Amino acid sequence: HHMIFKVFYQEDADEAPVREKTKTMYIEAESERDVRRKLEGRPINIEYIQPLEGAHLEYE
């Protein structure tokens, strides 16, 4: 039951307090938890994860 997710995230990278632009990322995963797993260790802060029904990437 894998699908595509829209990740609303802000760049942490890393410390130096500024107003950040909320960015978006489209990523394949098994679930929301799997998204967080895939992106842990990357210098970003996830605001919200959105499942995208009927969504696809180029090479599946």
GROMACS .gro file of C-alpha atoms in nm:
model
   60
    1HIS     CA    1   0.000   0.000   0.000
    2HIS     CA    2   0.273   0.245  -0.104
    3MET     CA    3   0.181   0.592  -0.230
    4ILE     CA    4   0.300   0.949  -0.282
    5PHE     CA    5   0.303   1.210  -0.006
    6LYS     CA    6   0.319   1.589  -0.010
    7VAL     CA    7   0.553   1.704   0.266
    8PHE     CA    8   0.516   2.063   0.382
    9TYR     CA    9   0.850   2.137   0.547
   10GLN     CA   10   1.072   2.423   0.659
   11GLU     CA   11   1.448   2.422   0.619
   12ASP     CA   12   1.620   2.394   0.956
   13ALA     CA   13   1.974   2.364   0.815
   14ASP     CA   14   2.054   2.434   1.082
   15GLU     CA   15   2.071   2.717   1.336
   16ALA     CA   16   2.067   3.095   1.278
   17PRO     CA   17   1.717   3.218   1.354
   18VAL     CA   18   1.549   3.351   1.038
   19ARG     CA   19   1.199   3.345   0.892
   20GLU     CA   20   1.195   3.041   0.663
   21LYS     CA   21   0.987   2.979   0.352
   22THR     CA   22   0.761   2.676   0.381
   23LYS     CA   23   0.865   2.436   0.104
   24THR     CA   24   0.706   2.124  -0.046
   25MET     CA   25   0.838   1.779  -0.136
   26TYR     CA   26   0.680   1.487  -0.319
   27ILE     CA   27   0.809   1.153  -0.192
   28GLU     CA   28   0.717   0.786  -0.219
   29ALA     CA   29   0.662   0.586   0.101
   30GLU     CA   30   0.452   0.317   0.270
   31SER     CA   31   0.295   0.555   0.519
   32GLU     CA   32   0.339   0.876   0.712
   33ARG     CA   33   0.577   0.715   0.960
   34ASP     CA   34   0.783   0.589   0.667
   35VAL     CA   35   0.810   0.946   0.534
   36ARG     CA   36   0.947   1.073   0.866
   37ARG     CA   37   1.191   0.781   0.871
   38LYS     CA   38   1.318   0.859   0.520
   39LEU     CA   39   1.367   1.227   0.605
   40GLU     CA   40   1.511   1.193   0.957
   41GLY     CA   41   1.874   1.304   0.964
   42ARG     CA   42   1.806   1.567   0.698
   43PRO     CA   43   1.822   1.926   0.825
   44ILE     CA   44   1.452   2.004   0.783
   45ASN     CA   45   1.139   2.041   0.996
   46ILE     CA   46   0.819   1.878   0.871
   47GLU     CA   47   0.511   2.094   0.924
   48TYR     CA   48   0.258   1.859   0.769
   49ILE     CA   49   0.244   1.539   0.563
   50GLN     CA   50  -0.040   1.495   0.314
   51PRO     CA   51  -0.128   1.166   0.144
   52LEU     CA   52  -0.193   1.215  -0.231
   53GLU     CA   53  -0.448   0.973  -0.373
   54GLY     CA   54  -0.400   0.888  -0.741
   55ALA     CA   55  -0.055   1.049  -0.739
   56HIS     CA   56   0.254   0.909  -0.913
   57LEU     CA   57   0.622   0.973  -0.983
   58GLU     CA   58   0.794   0.933  -1.321
   59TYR     CA   59   0.962   0.593  -1.269
   60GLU     CA   60   0.765   0.351  -1.052
   0.00000   0.00000   0.00000
